Amino acid sequence: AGPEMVRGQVFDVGPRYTNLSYIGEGAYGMVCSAYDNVNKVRVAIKKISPFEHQTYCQRTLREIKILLRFRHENIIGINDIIRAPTIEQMKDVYIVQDLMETDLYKLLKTQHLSNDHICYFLYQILRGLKYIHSANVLHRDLKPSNLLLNTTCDLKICDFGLARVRWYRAPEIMTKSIDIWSVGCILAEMLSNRPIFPGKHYLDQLNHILGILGSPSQEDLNCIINLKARNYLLSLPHKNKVPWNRLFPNADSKALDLLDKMLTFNPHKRIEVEQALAHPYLEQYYDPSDEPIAEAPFKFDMELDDLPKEKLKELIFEETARFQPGY
Ligand SMILES: O=C1c2cc(-c3ccnc(N[C@H]4CC[C@@H](O)C4)n3)cn2CCCN1[C@H](CO)c1cccc(Cl)c1
Structure with a gap:
């Protein structure tokens, strides 16, 4: 043959x-x-x-x-x-x-997730992410299609093709905090079955983010170092923050409190993965006894670039x- x-x-x-x-x-x-x-x-x-x-x-x-x-x-x-x-x-x-049987992209196209399943999936993402970050690695491409599910709701992160030592992309990019931003986007999508910031391009991505978070504060503003981007954001009119409970009216308030802290514009004020695991939203699953870390950080002995x-x-x-x- x-x-x-x-x-x-x-x-x-x-x-x-x-x-x-x-x-x-x-x-x-x-x-x-x-x-x-x-x-x-x-x-x-x-x-x-x-x-x-x-x-x-x-x-x-x-x-x-x-x-x-x-x-x-x-x-x-x-x-x-x-x-x-x-x-x-x-x-x-x-x-x-x-x-794996399916992925979260496919699952969210066809199924409504109970708050308990949202919770359990979020927990697994963060548990996986804690291990990755503890190895000093960034995934950089977290999104529903790269979260694989088997029949018994076990979740696995895949596609480490962009891992290093648009809809899901942090505002900075346009650090470990970019993965947390992605996870926030995924949580929002699990809450509503639709992407929270579905921009068509670079600029449009920012406009959507700003449409929800409101105009950046001035301390926020100098997170954006790119000078084209900075002037563009300065060029825009004021935008009011939309409260999370208005965007997700039927969502668990603990889930929205965590979402708020993941989708923080300023990467330095964004929640970290251990803090997120410890959030009250995930209390039912949090088990710091059973959340292993990498024995030692990852390091390239050759720069590959x-x-x-x-x-x-x-x-x-x-x-x-x-x-x-x-x-
Ligand atoms: O790495 C992966 C990858 C591997 C799988 C995978 C593994 C095990 N089990 C199932 N099960 C599936 C059955 C149905 C479905 O819903 C889940 N999928 C899913 N992905 C996500 C999309 C494809 N890529 C990346 C791109 O993102 C890639 C692939 C090939 C070349 C290059 Cl350069 C990059």
Whole structure:
């Protein structure tokens, strides 16, 4: 039987992984489910084709290094990696992960979440996030489609492609605090089943944020260092703050108090992940005895940003060597 294929794309993961089914895609790859004939379960397989671009090579190496270091129930792991036997033939990398049933994006398109389920999902996000940040890592792309759910409401954070040592993007960007902003956006979306700040572009993103939080204070204002952005915000008329209980009339007041502290304009006054876990909203789940941290911070021994993509390819080849037969 020849090399496998999905939607006209080579997906060369047999003989161990067969019965492929398309799930989704990324900027330079594709995810499928597959049958693993060793473990006799279906798994997810992420195909990545980074090697034409230094940036993609950087992200791929970081993602692999980070996930191989991490071990945590609320974080997707790596079970296996397939690539060609020689660097000259390596044009893709296949990362094998636990297959999850659905994600929060799909769930919120079709289901109303009870306050208890919102609470339990938020708790799991933050528990996962506490571990990540404790490793001195930023996820940088938290959003509902990167939060995976299995049948029994277990949540796992995936896609560490942008991890480092528009709708979900913090105002700063336009630090660990940017992840908390994202989580706030996700909480708001769990409350209403719609994105809280659905901007079409950069400027429009800001306008939506300002439409809810009101015009920035002057101390707030010099969080925005970009001079184009600063003058733009100065150019706008005054905007009144909309109270959270007016935006989410049927929401738990404890949930809104926490939301308020996550969606704080000034990153320095935004709640941190441990404080958030300790908030009264999450009291029913908070268990500081059972919220592990990383044994030590993560650190790159090479800065990856400066390396030619050929050297990065070599590092990716070496990094993945451990999963090769007879290694
Ligand atoms: O990394 C991932 C990723 C891996 C999975 C995943 C893993 C295990 N289990 C399920 N289960 C799914 C079944 C149905 C569905 O709702 C949940 N999904 C979901 N994602 C999120 C979207 C796709 N990416 C990123 C982009 O974001 C990516 C992929 C490929 C190449 C590149 Cl460059 C980037």
